[PDB]
Amino acid sequence: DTYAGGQVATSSNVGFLGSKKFLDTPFNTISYTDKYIEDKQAKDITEVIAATDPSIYTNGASGGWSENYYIRGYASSTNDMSMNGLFGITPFYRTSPEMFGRVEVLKGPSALLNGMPPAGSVGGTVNLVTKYAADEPFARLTTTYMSDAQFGGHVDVGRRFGENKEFGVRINGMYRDGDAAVNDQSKESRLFSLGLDWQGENARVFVDAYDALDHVDGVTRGVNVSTAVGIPKPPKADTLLSPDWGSVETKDKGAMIRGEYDFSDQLMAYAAYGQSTTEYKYNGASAGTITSSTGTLSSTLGQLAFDVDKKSADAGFKGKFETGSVKHQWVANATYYNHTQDDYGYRIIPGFSDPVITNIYDPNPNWGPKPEFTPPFLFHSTLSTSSFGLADTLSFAQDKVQLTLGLRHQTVKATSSVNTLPENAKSATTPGVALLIKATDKISVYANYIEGLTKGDQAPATASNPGEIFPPQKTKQQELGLKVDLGTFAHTLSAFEITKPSSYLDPSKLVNNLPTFVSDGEQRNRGIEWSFFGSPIEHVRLMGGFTYLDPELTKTKSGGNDGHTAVAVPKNQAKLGAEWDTQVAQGTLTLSGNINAVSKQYINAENTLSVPGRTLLDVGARYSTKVEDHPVTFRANIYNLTNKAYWAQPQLTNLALGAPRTYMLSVSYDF
Amino acid sequence: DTYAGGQVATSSNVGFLGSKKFLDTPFNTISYTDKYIEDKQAKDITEVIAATDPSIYTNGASGGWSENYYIRGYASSTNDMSMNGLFGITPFYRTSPEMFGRVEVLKGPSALLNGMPPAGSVGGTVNLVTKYAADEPFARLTTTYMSDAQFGGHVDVGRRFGENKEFGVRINGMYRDGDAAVNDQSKESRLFSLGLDWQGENARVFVDAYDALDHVDGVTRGVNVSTAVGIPKPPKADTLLSPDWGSVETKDKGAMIRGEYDFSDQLMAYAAYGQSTTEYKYNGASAGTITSSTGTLSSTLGQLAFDVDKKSADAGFKGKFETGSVKHQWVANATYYNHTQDDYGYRIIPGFSDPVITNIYDPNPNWGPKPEFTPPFLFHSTLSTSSFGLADTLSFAQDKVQLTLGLRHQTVKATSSVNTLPENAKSATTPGVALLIKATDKISVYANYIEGLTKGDQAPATASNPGEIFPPQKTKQQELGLKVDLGTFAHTLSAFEITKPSSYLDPSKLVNNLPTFVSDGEQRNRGIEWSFFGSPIEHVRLMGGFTYLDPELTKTKSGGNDGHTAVAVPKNQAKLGAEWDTQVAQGTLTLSGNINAVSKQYINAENTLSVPGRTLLDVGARYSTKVEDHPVTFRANIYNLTNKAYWAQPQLTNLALGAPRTYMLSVSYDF
Amino acid sequence: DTYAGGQVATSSNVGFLGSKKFLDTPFNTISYTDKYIEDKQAKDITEVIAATDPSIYTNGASGGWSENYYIRGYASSTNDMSMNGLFGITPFYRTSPEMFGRVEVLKGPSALLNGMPPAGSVGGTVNLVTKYAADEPFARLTTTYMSDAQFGGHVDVGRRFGENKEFGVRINGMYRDGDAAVNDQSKESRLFSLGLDWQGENARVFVDAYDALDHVDGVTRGVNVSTAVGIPKPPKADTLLSPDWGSVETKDKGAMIRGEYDFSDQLMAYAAYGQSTTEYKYNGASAGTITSSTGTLSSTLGQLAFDVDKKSADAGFKGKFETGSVKHQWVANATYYNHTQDDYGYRIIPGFSDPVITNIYDPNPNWGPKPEFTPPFLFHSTLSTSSFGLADTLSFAQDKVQLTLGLRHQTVKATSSVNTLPENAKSATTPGVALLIKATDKISVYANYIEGLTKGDQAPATASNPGEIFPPQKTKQQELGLKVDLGTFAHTLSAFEITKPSSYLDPSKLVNNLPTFVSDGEQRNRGIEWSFFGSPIEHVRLMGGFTYLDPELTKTKSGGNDGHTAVAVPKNQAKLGAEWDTQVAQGTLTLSGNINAVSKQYINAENTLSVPGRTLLDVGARYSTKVEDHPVTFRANIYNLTNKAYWAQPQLTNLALGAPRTYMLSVSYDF
């Protein structure tokens, strides 16, 4: 199932259409292997999916309170990742990748395929495929270092049981802690995971469970800027511009079960259920504001905690039949997601309401005393979603022409203990259509129309349409593409247009002489993408590509920012990762390099503040051998080799510094 | 005509004496190949000629408004380079070397050979030999990167035409743009060149034309220091100490034609004609001054633009005959150069006359707003030069003794539309003599006497001799040397004394109670040079040397600085470039290193300010292979790999920082 | 005598017990070869012994006025090294290792074996074994570079003479000079050494002499901190926090002779005599004090010079006898050491009495003018020590059980020309016992009890017991260990407890209503050490280990700091140095890496100030080949490759910055 090079897989999960090969998939998809994850020494999902993919963008900060990435120029929430196709299971804000065999990306919205995930983001879907036991007993220990002083280890063990190895047990354990590459920042991660499976004659069961901890001392919050003051030059890249005493901690625990039942070679049922809990806590700056061009920083302090309990389910049937010369491959499913949440916080900490005044260039800032962590209860909230979907792929000529049609009906309801307005469920129906034509055994041409959904907002009691809750809001994509598999090297070329609506109270629009809450806002992202992966020549691997994006705010409240460029994202990206192997003694030496080049980004929707493009370099070396026939692999990587200091836009604040030059070492041994 | 290693050629153009071999040339000469240029990833001529040559010195700044180098301890102006032996064609201030097959240096003055080039510099002559089409059709594409974010490409394509391939067309095109290695500095270069030739039975014609752009944003101008304040420690090497908004742009366009006609095997005529235009624009600091030992910098702003139209010609006869046992090879020529120029500028920019105050160590200097570029017309100027030269080389004893004798008459006139003083042409006659003895077929001993000319200065209205224009001023060299070609490795050892006059207003010589303008000043440069090139053992290349230079101010105004050491140049240099090849899979891996070690330099003629010596290291790797039988070469270079911060003296200001650690990558493919 | 890998030897000198093998030595011992020394490009003894040994700690500053290291958590003075077993010969404060064949370490105190060395330090003994002529004539030249601009060379030549090569001459000469890796620091070293030997039938003579110079401009003195102000973040690693004009120079000259006479195979005599002189001069800061969290530094200036003339001797007998099945090997000796010293200095320099005020973060501090060096004579002083010792090693059960017993009687007297208090000799008697069991041919278990001695302090005139001189003070060790020699790889596991007394004025213990001077203080170091060396698989070398140390202040003045952790030393260390060889062309390429990880250290005995742990990385490459059958080796090393900035505790002041990233190159050629 692995492509030449061993770092990319040949198939991925296409939502409820299930597993499909590269040349059969009328969507821009990529699937990274666990070998790739270990080769990058990836510490989070971003470090897997953003490194070579020009359609993914991260601000690249070290030690933030979550991962942050865009796909096709739109936010793709960490909340919205799937685990083996099921949403609401994965860690809330950051995921260390040790428990995954594959990390899959499907670019653009996918409501027909996947329904509406909990945060309603539309950029793309990240699907994490868990590890299960291979046939041969397996035990691998890996030790890790990351500068300045973060040490860790990871154990991965598998074995199968029973007369026909019908049972599997796969366990991963990981711990790392210590000072990171940013001053006064330390990063602690912990994971324990279990992947269990039973393979029956007609039936199969897969069970996954994990317990995770993510903790950052000296967490990065980022800083705000104004047009009056402007953006000063970035301090050196290892500067921490949030309180040294600030910290974030997230505990995630999840479990899921999937069953499959083969009625025949033409019909199968499946059911999946899962639950997870998240406990988040944050004590630190709510925002730092740069109040002078000389680097004065005024930081207000805040505290936040929330606890959320999630449950999710997805069940259905898949079948196939041939009528005349036409093959039908169909799927029908029903999905459910529910969460209950409690929020706690201080906007103003009692006794700590004065801002802390520092300077961003000070080598020795005084962040003052740490406020005790005691945020009071604010409100209880719930979210409930359900869907049911149907799709059919009609094919002829041995699958060389494939037309997919489907619909999904989606419902959503939200509640909050402090909302006084009506709370009602709302629904929408979302279609999709895709066409794929195989020009040759190597070339597929495809097109799709598909939507993304986002929970509707609620009009205030003051509106002409008072208290109206909008139905799920449709993001719309059209895409045309071309895929070429030359054998050991593969290309994808695609062009897309995606429109995403937004809602606001508009006093320019009266009904009954009252302001109307409208869904009249729009962002439109047009893009063209050329990407590639594999081995173009023997002993060489290349992954990367080029994108041009036009992310336009086409319609904004009062028209003030109409035609402006969306914030945060660059219009242009070029990424290339290369590896070259040489046989030396009794093993393989690999040298690697990465270049990541982006153009400028706007910091505000007025487009009066921006930060420039930047190009980052990475280099690495790997040595793979056997010691007494035991596989051993040594890895060394330097990220941000030039130690470029740059501003980029995180969530919730205007700017954060990009990660500094970072050294990583690992050694693995197979018992 | 390539020496072992492929990086140095075995002959060069010895002004109007034409092409001569290494062991037949009674001057210290070196010629670099286009292979060497590509191997260094040279971006300008300095990066070719300074890297390994201990008789050439550069201050080594990144993104200056021109190149800056000394030869034998005297300035050698960028204005004074020749193209295929003709002056006034090459780019005015910086030349990217993609259109040249050779870059040739002749060390020391050469007025007999070359006449007086436009800026009257005397250190040495740099001759750029253009590319013409080889017999086999040729196409090479190269992609380039230079840190942080400069990307570019270069196409080189040649083909010959006609039944006997008597016509050739060679085209180069190059573009690169983006952030350089210095903070807030970006470099843009563009070149399009055409090399055309026709080879007849008794005649030959060569045509060359190019269009070039050089543009730097965040141009480095340098800073001034005083004895009262002193020289502070250098900021980190990637600091820009000129306005971040400052920029320079030079557009150069040139064309030349050379024709030769063979009357017989004993007589030939030749003629060369060319023209060029330069359009220069600068908006930035005119100088920074360090006004405190805390690092306070006061930067006055200025603007300059000039447009210059140049024409140039060189025509003559060459012949040979024998008288008894003596062979004669003689040449007679006439040369002409004319330019017209318009200057525009502000010494004091309206609204920007106050200097911008920063600190050299600040990470966030405030350079203020960028002034609009509207410099008014100042004056029209012209420069005209002409010469008539004669030389004969007499050969005795089967060409083992070669005596060259010659003289040249040189005229020069300058005008300015705002000069009120008389304008008159002035002339001088400059002789030369050189003797070469071939001790063996491998060993040559040589001596020369030769001069360099510089336009005479004009006495100011305040002098006893007001408005007097001095004739062209004679720099005088005597040299003794030894050359040894061992086969695949060669040595040169030479010793020289060069005296250069200077003119000034002298209050110690009163005539009618007024100071007299005199041509009494002198600098005397004495030196010893040992250098070498080639392959001293299999799979190794080695090029470099050692120099000692004693650049003394022997006569100065009022005797105040008599016996002091000249500014800017080091007394000691040691340079070594090494390469080592080894077979790796199906290709050749080359590892390279360079060291460049110099001693201290004085910053003022009083010798009360100095900067220390520094040692710079470079490393590189190259991999040459084939992909489907197409030659491919990968190149990686790190210059200033330790990222040493150092001051050195540029033109017009006292100090500028040396270039920081800089990464360069390239990939070439032959079609 | 060399272990697998060539970097460690299989035996070492165990004080007067003489040469013993690894598995026969009931002490934790290691001996490094001259090959290891050249492989590290070690510039001093610290760079040999601390790199991989987790029981040795250095603060790691560049260009201090001496080396500074701890063994088993106690100071081990540079003054206390032996040369071929003799104390008082080696350079006083820093030793460049070019003249040594072996650098041996014995961990923990060793008074029975070694007596009391001149500074009375107890952490361990470093024994430097000089080079003598091998049988085959030898001549090696090595050139060196160290960043930024330090160049040097080293010649090593040997030849033997006489019909049976019974005479040997071995000469080393080394010079290096230039700018080092710290800002405004330059390092000059010089050495000339001679090793002569005569091998007779029943007698042998060895003579050694050397003349050395160590000079640092921009010497690092370190800085003081208070609890009121605290420890600010370290400036960048290449910062010099002492005067740029400050300098230190030490000249050391030494010579020794050793003679042996074999009366029979059961009895031998030996005698060793030596002398040395040291001339020390220091002009610079006496201390800098950090007086604000903004980085304000107040430096007082001082001058010190001292001259010391040393003489030393060690003579005895060794023999063997048997009592039944028990073999006896015994030794008896007498030792002597005397020095005379003159001290000169200013505590307050006339004209320079005001402190110099700088800031630690200033890139351009103003250190003011350099005071002339004229320190006046202060006082004459002397130190005299003598001992007599006896030991027997009883070997039972075919040498599988080896019991060593002995005692030594030690005397010491000090004088000073400005002391008015009484001056009297004092004595002590010190036992030692060690047991070694060879469990197999590969495995040894051992235990020891042994002491270290330090000259007693003298009670001040203010005490109840004024002028009382305490006898030599007993440091006491118990140790248990395990050694395993697997063949080409070896392990040591040891545990120790060492108590060291200290003396102070106790205000709680009144005699005649006055405080009493007592020898009641104690530090107790408990530790566990796991270390290893050799070649665990072909083409790989690995050296390093892990230690846990508990250095507790068990008894302190007034009980104030009882139970606190001792200053300066970390509780945890992990070190690993690895090398990997592969054939490239006609030679061997070695890649090397080192990691050095330590935990936090306390800065004061109150344990209210500390500095964090740090982890340092080093890398290197070596290429060994032949050119025309002459051995040539190229070496490249980068130390502190991440350029980590850290504080650690030097001698006499609270803090000093660790050495920055440092580049080293060398090339050797064998004639």
Residue numbers in the entry:
A (entry chain C), B (entry chain B), C (entry chain A): 33 to 703
Published text:
The apo structure of BauA was solved to a resolution of 1.8 Å by single wavelength anomalous diffraction (SAD) using selenomethionine-labeled proteins. Residues 33 to 703 of the protein are well defined in the electron density map, while the N-terminal region comprising the TonB box is missing, presumably because it is flexible. Compared to the other TBDTs, the extracellular loops of the β-barrel form a large open cavity bordered by mainly short and apolar amino acids giving large access to the loops NL1-NL3 of the plug domain. The asymmetric unit contains three monomers arranged around a threefold symmetry axis reminiscent of the porin arrangement and thus plausibly biologically meaningful. PISA, a computational assessment of oligomeric state in the crystal, suggests a trimer with a high degree of confidence. Biophysical methods (gel filtration and light scattering) do not support a trimeric assembly. Size Exclusion Chromatography coupled to Multi-Angle Light Scattering (SEC-MALS) analysis in C8E4 is consistent with monomer whilst native gel shows the protein runs more closely to a dimer; however, the detergent bound to the protein may increase the apparent weight suggesting a monomer in solution.
The A. baumannii outer-membrane transporter protein, BauA, that recognises this siderophore has itself been identified as a vaccine candidate. The siderophore is known to be bound from the medium by the integral outer-membrane BauA protein. BauA has the typical outer-membrane TonB-dependent transporter (TBDT) fold with a β-barrel formed by 22 antiparallel strands, several extracellular loops, and a plug domain folded inside of the barrel. Acinetobactin is synthesized as a precursor, preacinetobactin, which rearranges non-enzymatically and irreversibly at pH >7 to give acinetobactin.
